[PDB]
Symmetry: D3
Subunit: 245 residues, 6 copies
C-alpha cells in the first residue's frame, strides 16, 4: 500500500482532504455511519479507517489509538495521502468543578505534557489549534445547544501519573507531577487528555489545520475513574466537518 | 500615592473600566483614546501612560506597556488589581513570511515563547495562547474595515536583535540557540516577530484574564532587517473592544 | 472489570505474574498459541489480551499498541492485576551496518527520546532492563541459535522525525533530531523502536522486572521503509523466568 | 534621520562619547546629566531618553533603558553601534537580607539570571558578571563618599511580582519555580532583587563591553513587599565612578 | 617521555594490556596489583597511580582514577589511547536501601546521572549502562566467591555531601533539586550512592569501550551519614580480579 | 582519628587558620607551603595533601583538591567544617585567546559553568563569581610583582578532552553540545579553560565563604592542543598576606 502503518492508498481517499480522527477504532464505524455512503477502508493495528461522503464530499474517519506517538503516525501517513484538515474527537476528564459530565470541550491550545510534540517543535512553540477549525467547532456546538467550554487542555503522555492519579500500583507520583493537578486547575486548564498536544503541535508547525473537541466522561474533582452520553461531541464534530469542506 | 506602585492609578480612576487596550508606545495612547468618547488623561509614570475613555457608554482603559514582557507584566498585573479583566494588545511587528506585506494586519492565536517573563507565570509547556473571544472579535473587526489580515502564530522574543536573528549589529554574531532560527520559524508557519505577546498571553491565560493580540506589519524580514521611516491596526483594536464590552 | 482500559479482572489472570507484551494486537494469538491452553480474555481498543500456561503456570499475552503512552497504560493495569515481570517483543529498525534483517536484538538500556518515561523518573534515571530478564533473553537466543546483538536502543515517541526519516509530508526534521541518527550510530546505538524507553523506565523505577527483545525488519543504512526467532526467544525466556 | 532605529541617535550626537550611564527612569536622565558639564538633550523616543554631557573634558552619554532586560538590550546594542564601550547602570532595588537598610548602596558583582534576554547573548552556564574595572570604580567611589555599601550578588528578575515572590497580587499565586525562591536566594547570600542587571551584565561580558552596576535600596523585603512613598548616594557614586573609568 | 599527558605512561609500559582495573584510591592500586602475577609499579602522577601485572599470561593494568567523573574521565581516556578496551571499576559506596548491609557487594547495571562529566560524552537521554559481559562476569564472580550480592541501579553524584543529601555540613543546606532526593531514589529502588560510575559507564557505552562497576558497602544511609572508622569485607577486590579472568 | 571524613584533619591541626590556598596537584602543596613560615605537613590521604604554615604570624592552610569539581567540593566542605572561610585557588590553565601567552597569569572574575558539581549548590542561573576582596587581592598582588595579567571570565569544564573541544582522542568525536564551543567561548571573550573554578566559586558564593582564583598559563589552544612559570605561586601567596 501507499503508507506503512495505515495500509491505505491515495485511491482509497477518492479526493478526501479532511479527516475526523477519534482515538477508538470501534467508534470509527459509528461516526462514519452518521454520514453518506460509509465504506470500510482498512484495519491494521490500532488504525481503523472508513470513507464517507458529506454534502457530496469525501471525508475520511480514522482512529489514531491512544497517545501522541501513534497519533503522529496517523496524521503523517494521512498527510502523505492528501489529508490537510484533522478534527480530533475524544473523551476527556475535566479538572474544573464547574464542568459537568456530558459537557463538551473545545481546545484552543494544549499544555504539552507529552513527548511527541517535541519531535515537531521545541517546547516554546504553542500547541495551538487552527482558528478556522476551532471557530467551526464552537459554532457547531452552539447550533445544537450543547453546554460548551472553550480553553486550554492538559495533554499527558500517561493516563495515571501525568494526570496525577494515585490509585495505582505504586501509589506514587514523580516530583514533576506531584501537586500538578491543582496547579493546572489554578491556571484555568479545563481538562486532561492524551493526544491534543501531539496533534495540535505537528499540525501547527507543518501547515496542516487541526481542531480538537472532547466529551467530558469524568470530573477529577470528584473521582479518578469514569463510570461505565458522548453522542454530543460526535454530532458536533460531524457538523463542524460540514462547515470546513 | 495611589493603589498601585508603578501605574500611579487608583480604582476610582478607572470608573468601573474592565477592558484595557495596551499599546507599546506611550505616545500612541492619546491617539487611541481620542478615537473613543470622553477621553481623560489619568497618569504618566516611566513608560506607563494611561488614559480613560468611553465606548458605547462603558469606561475603557488605554495604557502603554513599554517594550518587552517585564514592563508588560507590571502593567497587566497592576491594571488587573484595579479591576481590568480583558486586555487587547496593539503593536507593530516584522513579518517573516514572503506573502505578508507591510501594512498588513496580524492577529495572533498563540506565540512561540522566546521570552522569560512568561516563565514566571506558567512553565514552558503551557501555551501562550490568546483568548478565543478576543481573537474572534479582532478577526471580525478586521473584516468590518476590510483590512488584509493574517491569523496565526507569532514568535515572541526578549530581544530585538539576536533573538530575531539580526546580524547587522555591534558583535555581528548570534548565539547558537538563535542562529538559524528565523528560517526554522518560517518553515513552521510562524508569521512574525514581536516582543510582548508571549508574556501577555501566558500571564492572562494562566490567571483567568482574557487577552487578544493585533499588530501592524512595518517590515518584511525577507526583504530587509530595519523597517523604513514610514492605521488599520488601531481601528481594528478599537472596533474589537466595542464587540467585547 | 477491575481495570479501566484492559477490561480484565484479577480472576481472568488465574494468578499470572508474568506477561509477554507485543505491540501488534494481531500478534497476540500467535504468541499465545506457542504455549498451552491459550484462552482469549479481552479485547478493547489496542489492548488484546490472551492467557496461556507455560512451565505449569498462568502467563499473560497482551498487546500495548504503538508508543509509550498506551504501553504505560497496559503495564500499570496489569501490575494492578498481579503482573510483576514484563517481556517486550517487538520489531525494530537497525542503524548499524553489521546488523541484518532477521537478526535479533536484546536491549540492555534505552536512549530516552520519549515522553512517558519522565512521568516515572527524571531524565537522569537510566532506562535500564532488569538483569535477570536480559540474561534469560540472551541465553534463550544462544540456544535457539539466532544471530543476536546486545546493547543500547533508541526509543522514540515518533516513527518519522524522531527516527530521522525525511521522506515525509514536510520533508523536515526539527533541530533536535537533525543529524541525530549518525550521532546515535557513532555512540554504538543498535536500533530504533518506540516503546522500550517507557517500559524500561516505569518498570525499573517501581520494583518491576522488564526486558526487551526485537527482530530487525529494516536496516536504515540502506532504506527508510521496510520492504519468528524473536517470538521463540521471548517465549523461551519467559519459560526461564518462571 | 538617525543611525539607530530605536534611540533616534547619530554617531555625531555622541561627540566621541565612549562611556554611558544608564538609569531606568527617563525622568532621571536630565537630572543625572546636569550633575556633569555641558548637559544637552539628544533625543527622546518611547522609554529611551538620552542626554549628552561632559566629564573632566570627555563627552559622556546618559540614556534611560526603561524597565526590563528587553528594552535594556536594545538601548545597549544601539549605543554600542554608536561607539559606547562602557556602561554604568544606576537603579533602585529591593533588598532581601536583614542587615541591609533602606538608603544603603549595593554594588553587584554578578547577577542571578532570572531573566530571558541574557539567554539571547549567552547560554545559562555563562556568568552575568560585572567588569572588574567598573566594579572597582563603583566600590572606591562609594568608600570615598562614605556611603554604607554592600558588594555581592543580585537576583535579576523578568518580573516585579511573581519573580520576586510577591503574593499580594491579583492572582495571589506564584508559580512552582518561584515558590519558596526568595528564602533560597537569602540562604545563598543574595543581596537584592532588580530587573535589568542580568541582561546588561551578560550581554556586555560576552561582547567585549564593560559593565558596572550600583543601586539604591528603597525597600527591605523582610519588612514589607511594596516600598513606601519616600541621600542620593547612588547617583553621586555612579558619576564619581565614571570619572575614574574615563 | 610518555605518550599521554596526565598518566605518564607509554604504550610500551602496558605490555599490550587490554584490560584495566580502576579503583579510586591511589593507595589501593598496589594492593590489587599484588593479588596478581608479577606486579610492577609504572607511574604515579597527581591522583593517577598505575601498576602493571599479569593475569593468566595476559598483561593487566591497575590505575587509580581519584574521586569524581572529571579525573575518572581523564584516566579512562588516556588508558584508551594506550590500548585499553575494558574497564573494571572497584570502589566503596553507601547504601540507601534498608535491606543492604555493610560489607555487602553491589554490581551496578546502570546509573542515575547526577554528574556533569557524562554530559560531555552523551546527552542526558542516553543511559549510563554497564557492559553486559562485564556485568555478567562480575555477578558470576560474586556467586563463586559466595558474597552477599545485590544487582541494580546506582546513583552517581558529583558531590559527596549535598548531592547525596547529607545535612551535617557547614551550611546544613541542600539545594532544592537534591532536597528530598534520597528518599525518591529509595522509592525508585536505587541501591546506593557513589561518585564515578555515571561518567565511567556513559563515556564507555558511547565510545565502544566495555565497563562494569562493583562496590563494597561501607555504610548504610538509613542508619547514619558518615561510615564508622566493622563489618567490612574485601570481597569486592576478590570479585573484580576473578571477573577480570572472565573478561580477558 | 579525624573530624572530617576525607581530609583526615582535626580542627586542632589548623591552629586557628581561616584561610586556605588550594592547588590541584598534591605534589605542589609542599613547595607552596615552603614559601612561608614554619611549614608542617598535616596529612595526606588520596589526593588531599595538606600542610599548615604561618604567614606574618598567622596560620594558613595549603591543601590540594585534586582534579575536578567533585573532589574540590569535598576538600572545600571539609576545610569549611574545620574553620576555613577564605579559599585561594591556584592552578594551571590553557588560554584560548591568541593575545594571551604561555607564562601569563590569569585572574578569574567568574566562570562559565561547564561542570556538574556547581549545580549541587546552586541552580544554573546563579553566577559562578569570585569574591571581590579576593579578586582585588590577587590583582593587586600580580601588579605588585610585575607579572603579565589578564582579568576576566574562565571556562570551567568537567572534562579535559571533549569539554575543552580536544579532538586528538581515542574516539576523535565531540558530542553535539561541545562541538563548535571553543570558537563560541572565544567570541564571548572567555580567557581560558580549567576544571575546578566553577565548582569552587559557586559553592563558596552561595554559602557565605570567600573564594578567589588565579592560574598560570601552560598552553595556548590557538597554537596547540597539549602543553609541552612560578609567577602564579608568588601571587597567591602575596594575596594571602593581604587577605590576612
Ligand atoms: O486522558 C484522559 N482521557 C479520558 C479521561 F476520562 C481522563 O480522565 N483522562
Ligand atoms: O519586535 C519587533 N517589532 C517591530 C518590528 F518591525 C520587528 O521586526 N520586530
Ligand atoms: O520504531 C520503529 N519500529 C519498526 C521499524 F522498522 C523502525 O525502523 N522503527
Ligand atoms: O525590581 C525591583 N526594583 C525596586 C524594588 F524596590 C524591588 O523590590 N524590586
Ligand atoms: O560516594 C560515596 N562513597 C562512599 C560512601 F560510603 C558514600 O556514602 N558515598
Ligand atoms: O583544564 C585544563 N588545564 C590545563 C591546561 F593546560 C588546559 O588546556 N586545560
Ligand atoms: K520597558
Ligand atoms: K496506541
Ligand atoms: K580527583
Amino acid at each position: 500500500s501507499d503508507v506503512f502503518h495505515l495500509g491505505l492508498t491515495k485511491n482509497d481517499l477518492q479526493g478526501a482532504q479532511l479527516a475526523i480522527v477519534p482515538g477508538d477504532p470501534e467508534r470509527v464505524e459509528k461516526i462514519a455511519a452518521l454520514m453518506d455512503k460509509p465504506v470500510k477502508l482498512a484495519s491494521h493495528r490500532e488504525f481503523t479507517s472508513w470513507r464517507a461522503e458529506l454534502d457530496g464530499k469525501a471525508v475520511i474517519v480514522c482512529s489514531t489509538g491512544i497517545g501522541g506517538p501513534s497519533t503522529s503516525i496517523a496524521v503523517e501517513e494521512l498527510a502523505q495521502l492528501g489529508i490537510r484538515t484533522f478534527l480530533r474527537i475524544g473523551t476527556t476528564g475535566a479538572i474544573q468543578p464547574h464542568i459537568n459530565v456530558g459537557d463538551v470541550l473545545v481546545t484552543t491550545a494544549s499544555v504539552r505534557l507529552d513527548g511527541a510534540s517535541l519531535h515537531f517543535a521545541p517546547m516554546e512553540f504553542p500547541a495551538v489549534a487552527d482558528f478556522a477549525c476551532t471557530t467551526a467547532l464552537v459554532e457547531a456546538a452552539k447550533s445544537i445547544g450543547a453546554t460548551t467550554h472553550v480553553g486550554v487542555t492538559a495533554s499527558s503522555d500517561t493516563f495515571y501519573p501525568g494526570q496525577e492519579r494515585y490509585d495505582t500500583y505504586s501509589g506514587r507520583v514523580v516530583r514533576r507531577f506531584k501537586g500538578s493537578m491543582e496547579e493546572w486547575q489554578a491556571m484555568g486548564v479545563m481538562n486532561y487528555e492524551m493526544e491534543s498536544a501531539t496533534l495540535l503541535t505537528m499540525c501547527a508547525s507543518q501547515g496542516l489545520r487541526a481542531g480538537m473537541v472532547a466529551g467530558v466522561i469524568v470530573n477529577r474533582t470528584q473521582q479518578e475513574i469514569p463510570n461505565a452520553t458522548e453522542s454530543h461531541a460526535v454530532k458536533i464534530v460531524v457538523e463542524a466537518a460540514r462547515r470546513l469542506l
